[PDB]
Design a protein around this ligand. Structure first.
Ligand SMILES: CC(C)CCC[C@@H](C)[C@H]1CC[C@H]2[C@@H]3CC=C4C[C@@H](O)CC[C@]4(C)[C@H]3CC[C@]12C
Ligand SMILES: CCCCCCCC/C=C\CCCCCCCC(=O)OC[C@H](O)CO
Ligand SMILES: CCN(CC)C(=O)N[C@H]1C=C2c3cccc4[nH]cc(c34)C[C@H]2N(C)C1
Length: 368
């Protein structure tokens, strides 16, 4: 008879490359938001909340998960801690995916509606959005402790069983991964359409005011400006006004009869328009550059969680598949997601200069 051997080396490899990078990676993100006041704004409370969720995985979920790998199938801890550990696993892992969904949506509405709210009014919006995400995560994770594990059986095997959590494995998976994925996919195309439209209207304005100064440049009479300059009447909230009244000021010279004086005044908007739309051009450029980074990073997160959730629902639907050689894959695919959830806030914040500069001095134990 050939029995299974030791697997301590795998657990050791997990500590080095999963647990330690998870706890440490999320600790840096939390510290950066907590210490550096330059990062203490509403948007980064999604990242801090997310970092906390993933931190608790590496602290209370991942270490105990080693015992399943390192020790026998029997639950070594007290029986009461079995559904709790199962609950915390589902809770925090779901919180990670739904946080990104929240961020994916929140980043989209920031593009469609640039002036969403003030600094104060958006600060409370964060807490509400964070709370909802956590409340969603609880409702998805709470079928586990309510149902419980199978209890003359003295000991217990702390594991989600297909014969019991069949509905939960299938539905929970849909509600925890495939549902936010569906949203992040929709908001993706919504974001792509938003950016290409936001720049389409800018190119429209940049071409319609240039066409109305060319007719202002080559002007024979003030009557030629009496209809052409009026077309520019409707084209930092002070931004739109500094050129509106400026264009209206030129019309005052047109009605007065000063044509040549108005043409030279129209050339004064050359340093006004260029310094304004180019400032709004990099606004879109940075908005497009930040969304592309968010897209790829969030994609890799979901992609690494894919092998688990696709296999998890397969364990339920496919009744023809080998149960033994399918749940053994789950025992590996979970850690792939654990790697994903662990380094998710870190990697995303490595593209931010302030976050990255903060991490550099926190490793050197500076803390300002
Ligand atoms: C629990 C088991 C796996 C062992 C403990 C893991 C150790 C190696 C991990 C977990 C948390 C990690 C720490 C998290 C926070 C910081 C602050 C940072 O400025 C320097 C690195 C440092 C100090 C990390 C070093 C490595 C660390 C201590
Ligand atoms: C799995 C592949 C299936 C569909 C991918 C569809 C296209 C890729 C969807 C990316 C989801 C995403 O994270 O998009 C965030 C968006 O960029 C925020 O504005
Ligand atoms: C570590 C505990 N054990 C040993 C039994 C596991 O097998 N845990 C897996 C189950 C999970 C799960 C199942 C169903 C719906 C779900 N929504 C969110 C999650 C989830 C998280 C997911 N975690 C990450 C891995």
């Amino acid at each position: 008879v050939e029995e299974q051997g030791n697997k301590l080396h795998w657990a050791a490899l997990l500590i080095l490359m999963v647990i330690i990078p998870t706890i440490g990676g999320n600790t840096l993100v939390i510290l950066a938001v907590s210490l550096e006041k330059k990062l203490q704004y509403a948007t980064n409370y999604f990242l801090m909340s997310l970092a906390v969720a993933d931190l608790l995985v590496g602290l209370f979920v991942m270490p105990i998960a080693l015992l399943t790998i390192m020790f026998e199938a029997m639950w070594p801890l007290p029986l009461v801690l079995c559904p709790a550990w199962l609950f915390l696993d589902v809770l925090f892992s779901t919180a990670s995916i739904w946080h990104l969904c929240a961020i994916s949506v929140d980043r989209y509405i920031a593009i469609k509606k640039p002036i969403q709210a003030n600094q104060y009014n958006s600060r409370a919006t964060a807490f509400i959005k964070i709370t909802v995400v956590w409340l969603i995560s609880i409702g998805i994770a709470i079928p586990v402790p309510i149902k419980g594990i199978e209890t003359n059986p003295n000991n217990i095997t702390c594991v989600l069983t297909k014969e019991r959590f069949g509905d939960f494995m299938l539905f929970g998976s849909l509600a925890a991964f495939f549902t936010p994925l569906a949203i992040m996919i929709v908001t993706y195309f919504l974001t792509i359409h938003a950016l290409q439209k936001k720049a389409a209207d800018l190119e429209d304005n940049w071409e319609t005011l240039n066409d109305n100064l060319k007719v202002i440049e080559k002007a024979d009479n003030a009557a030629q400006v009496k209809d052409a300059l009026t077309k520019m009447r409707a084209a930092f909230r002070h931004g739109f006004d500094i050129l509106v009244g400026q264009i209206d000021d030129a019309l005052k010279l047109a009605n007065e009869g000063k044509v040549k004086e108005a043409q030279a005044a129209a050339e004064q908007l050359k340093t006004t328009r260029n310094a304004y739309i180019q400032k709004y051009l990099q606004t879109i450029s940075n908005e497009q550059r930040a969304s592309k980074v968010l897209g790829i990073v969030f994609f890799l997160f979901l992609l690494m969680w894919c092998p688990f959730f696709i296999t998890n629902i397969t364990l339920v639907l496919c009744d023809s598949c080998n149960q033994t050689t399918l749940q053994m894959l789950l025992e590996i695919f979970v850690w792939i997601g654990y790697v994903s959830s662990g380094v998710n806030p870190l990697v995303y914040t490595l593209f931010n200069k302030t976050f990255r500069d903060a991490f550099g001095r926190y490793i050197t134990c500076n803390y300002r």
